[PDB]
Design a protein around this nucleic acid. Structure first.
Lengths: 92, 91, 78, 205, 99, 89, 79, 100, 92
DNA sequence: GATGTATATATCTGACACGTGCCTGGAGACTAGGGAGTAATCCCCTTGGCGGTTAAAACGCGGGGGACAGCGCGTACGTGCGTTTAAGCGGTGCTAGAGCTGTCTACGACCAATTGAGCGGCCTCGGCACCGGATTCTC
DNA sequence: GAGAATCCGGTGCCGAGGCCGCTCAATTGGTCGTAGACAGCTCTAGCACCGCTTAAACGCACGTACGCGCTGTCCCCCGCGTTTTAACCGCCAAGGGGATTACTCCCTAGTCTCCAGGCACGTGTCAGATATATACATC
């Protein structure tokens, strides 16, 4: 009844690694990681819905929030991967 | 020597460097002085959380304040070093 | 007492983790002092949340939120 | 390729309205029409140009092709800028003229950018991007010259960047087979009025 | 009858992020394409830090991730140290740093 | 000697870095982080850049000089400035 | 052609006198010209983003105020 | 009959309630909150301007200039911790001199 | 058409001081002061509408946000003044 | 004792406190429906205590290691002063660019049925933590 | 040139991952109001430049005030061995209150309607700025 993000982190770990197990405590760290970055970006992009006097959150505002909240090379890889996800989402 | 082994040992393991019950009695003593009369229940995980934060803060403070003793040519810390290290940040 | 539980070898190990080679003697007071002036600013910033949701119990999320507002974000214990 | 011309092409096509963007891209003659068929022309403009750049990421790009796209963009928005009229005197193939003008201008300063485009009534549209001897040429503030082979007249676009006006005038006078250049009172917005006020006098001298 | 992450080609969920981004009161209107992009960004960040953690896990001849491995994989990399600057990982310890 | 110079400059409030060199420096650094595009700074925002830069440098040299009196120096060496940034983080 | 030497040899001296430093050393003149430059990048790259988002070629004062607020060094006096 | 004068305040109440509706802060906004908020803002404004006016008076000038707010903030102890990460335009610093 | 807080600061200054004028620049500082504290408190109290799983902002949440965002004596005076304003607001 | 160091006033200069017109956002009214405050409950998580051990802290002691004070050489820095260069005023032009006013359309809230993806409880078994053993290293 | 540091092996143990039941929240689908992309027009305020002019930087010569390495002295933390002590483990009782559900009710939200307040504009006029000139403070 109280959800978390353990199953999805476990699926990503079994994707990019064959059999590397993860303890039940360190997984908790991953929860408080990715209940945190989502608090920043999807918080901070909300601020860019207020300075430009808008009311929506489209993909462009999240793109600029990722351009702000991350250092250089990691931000470049993230913005290169996200639109790659969106383009194969559009032609469903 | 001796210290050269202890720095290698303590930077390897990830234990709790402060004992449990004195830190818990200190936290309860501080919590009594605010909004008196009533007691305050503590969950057993919250005191561990505050202990991990306090240990990480003090280790980062000593490691940051040590760089103002190699800078003066000395080897040894002083309370001038710690007070200046807090003066630089603004805490 | 209730402050002398943070003994001399406790602060000594806290320093030897930090890379400090040789330690003076007066540190063992000021560190205790700064420890108190840390913990107070975590306690009341916790307990106000405890006084808002009207319960007599400080949860771990309250201390995590007090450290969130303080500046030092803590992971794991959420 | 470099990562500067992509922003220029993206900004130029963002300035193009959707009413004739397919006309611009058919007249520009740089991509395959199958790749025109691939691009959705019904979603919003903030991803159509991303798809078009991603087409131009793969095949070919330059600064010259982007400059020629800028020329074709400027040829359909003559209502925006304000023009100036020159004339030479004291004195023919256009290939030698192109080579002479480009070599004289590249010997004048270090960094310039010259681009030509052929248009009927023997017209040539000359885009000039000025610069210094230490900086890149500013693409975003061009200077356009409409030159005709028959008439000694030339239409001149104004710009933010002055101080290269007598340099361009003398370099174009030496680049042509002339010795004098004038600067009349004729400064207006529309090209057809200047065309009429020149050609009613020149065809009937 | 068809999953959102399966259209997305991702692994993090999409409907849960959209539910939180409506219920969090961040804006009064939520665009449809936003949480897919956001979930892809979160997936790339978690993939990067676990990809850096597993190499240090095999470096210590282990296959079970403890928080010390996450501490080292954060602090040794430069750009993640730029990102996770003011974060004290629990049960973490410090880098081997002498003089 | 210098003591009539400090107590004159900690009294006034005007700008110290001249406006046109700082404007040329900002227009130089800005064109590298935008893929070769010019911009048009409002005449108010350059004052904001210059005030933030002056406040940051004055606080930085105050903390660096606080470091210089610790080691017995009076002179402010470049070892002092590159250390008052790693402490502050 | 020097492009960072608009910061002069005594302008750094005026900033050090405002800070309250009695006697500058030598290579500080080559050090501060680094540090300022780095700081301006972490404003201008952070301030060219906001004005890129609102489709404006004009970098207003509010954009620099927002970027400085996001860095942590809040500026009041303009707007 | 205005809600500013009904509570005996000086800061507006309708504008604060308008900025709490359109500020995306919660789905519902009570009526007892923004009067409390405007009262706290009025107290902080009076707290600054009293010290600013006294420092302007002691410099024998009948006008408030940002150097006076700089002195009043950096000489007070509470506002030194409230505004500790604040730069002020046309600011200046404190008269700080120290020897060896 | 673009509002500000100049008139109200001017009224408070003429209340607590007889004739002390204020320049048109320093008044701007006061705008960026009190468009800022309102961003903190009425921002941060919104967070306390989310941890306790509520949807309203009453006076009690603003009271706790003032207890958090201010140092000791100033917070005590502010919480003592605010309820004094509210009690004479209730009996209208 | 001449060099600052504070003060009288000259006037002149422009910001600013103020007065008016005026557009629109704030107040009055009232229904309505979800938010929540109060009441009860039952378990579940915390508190208190008995007791025994065993690492862990406290305390003398001496010894080298280091901090501190003086000091001489010297060199890198402040200052004085003529030049020459670049910064400011200010004035003109003058046009790209903010913005803002309509429009129409794709698009996202809003809502009824429905079902499987994910959460709670459980059960190993291999990964791992610790304990004991065999192979290197500097004083 | 041998006690100390590193790698290795064996054994208990316990949490990590697989598995099932299930339920509620995410999906699918059809409806409608509207947020915002898009175009075009209009005022404005930022950039380029130029002539002047002049205030400040630049370059240099030089005197000398600290930087730094050295060295002597004296004190003062750290390692070591012994004694003492309280932290912890595991248990056992018990009970205070945290989480859950019900139920009414009340209080804020929406829409309409009316007008008083806060903003843009314009203007005389006092506050200070800077400048010169003259009475005190001092190494």
């Amino acid at each position: 009844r109280k959800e978390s993000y353990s199953v999805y982190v476990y699926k990503v770990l079994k994707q990019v690694h064959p059999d590397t197990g993860i303890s039940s405590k360190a997984m908790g760290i991953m929860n408080s990681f990715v209940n945190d970055i989502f608090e920043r970006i999807a918080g901070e992009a909300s601020r860019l819905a207020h300075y430009n006097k808008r009311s929506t959150i489209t993909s462009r505002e999240i793109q600029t929030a990722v351009r702000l909240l991350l250092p250089g090379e990691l931000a470049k890889h993230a913005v290169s991967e996200g639109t790659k996800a969106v383009t194969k989402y559009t032609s469903s | 020597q001796g210290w050269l082994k202890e720095i290698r040992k303590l930077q390897k393991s990830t234990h709790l460097l402060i004992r449990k019950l004195p830190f818990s009695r200190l936290a309860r003593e501080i919590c009594v002085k605010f909004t008196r009369g009533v007691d305050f229940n503590w969950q057993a995980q919250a005191l561990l959380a505050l202990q991990e934060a306090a240990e990480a803060f003090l280790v980062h403070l000593f490691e940051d304040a040590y760089l103002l003793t190699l800078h003066a040519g000395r080897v040894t810390l002083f309370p001038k070093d710690v007070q200046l290290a807090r003066r630089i940040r603004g805490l | 007492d209730n402050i002398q539980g943070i003994t001399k070898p406790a602060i000594r190990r806290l320093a030897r983790r930090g890379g400090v080679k040789r330690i003076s003697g007066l540190i063992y007071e000021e560190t205790r002092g700064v420890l108190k002036v840390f913990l107070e600013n975590v306690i009341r910033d916790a307990v106000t949340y405890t006084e808002h949701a009207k319960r007599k119990t400080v949860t771990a999320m309250d201390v995590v939120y007090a450290l969130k507002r303080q500046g030092r974000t803590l992971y794991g214990f959420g | 390729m470099d990562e500067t011309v992509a922003e220029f092409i993206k900004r130029t096509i963002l300035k193009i309205p959707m009413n004739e963007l397919t006309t611009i891209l058919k007249a520009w003659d740089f991509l395959s029409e199958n790749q025109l068929q691939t691009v959705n022309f019904r979603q919003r403009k903030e991803s159509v140009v991303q798809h078009l750049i991603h087409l131009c990421e793969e095949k070919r790009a330059s600064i010259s092709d982007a400059a020629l796209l800028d020329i074709i963009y400027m040829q359909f928005h003559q209502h925006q800028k304000v023009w100036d009229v020159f004339q030479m005197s004291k004195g023919f193939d256009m290939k030698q003229f192109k080579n002479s003008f480009k070599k004289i201008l590249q010997r004048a300063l270090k960094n310039v950018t010259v681009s030509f485009r052929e248009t009927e009534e023997n017209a040539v549209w000359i885009r000039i991007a000025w610069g210094t001897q230490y900086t890149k040429p500013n693409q975003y503030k061009p200077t356009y010259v409409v030159y005709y082979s028959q008439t000694p007249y030339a239409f001149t676009s104004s710009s933010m960047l002055r101080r290269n006006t007598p340099l361009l005038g003398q370099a174009l006078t030496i680049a042509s087979k002339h010795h004098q250049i004038v600067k009349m009172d004729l400064r207006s917005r529309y090209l057809d009025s200047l065309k009429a006020i020149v050609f009613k006098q020149y065809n009937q001298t | 009858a068809k999953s959102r992450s399966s259209r997305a080609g991702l692994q993090f969920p999409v409907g849960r992020v959209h539910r939180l981004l409506r219920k969090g009161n961040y804006a009064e209107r939520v665009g449809a394409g936003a949480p897919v992009y956001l979930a892809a960004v979160l997936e790339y960040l978690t993939a990067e830090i676990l990809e850096l953690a597993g190499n240090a896990a095999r470096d210590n001849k282990k296959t079970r991730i403890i928080p010390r491995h996450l501490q080292l994989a954060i602090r040794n990399d430069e750009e993640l140290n730029k990102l996770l600057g003011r974060v004290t990982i629990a049960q973490g310890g410090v880098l081997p740093n002498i003089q």
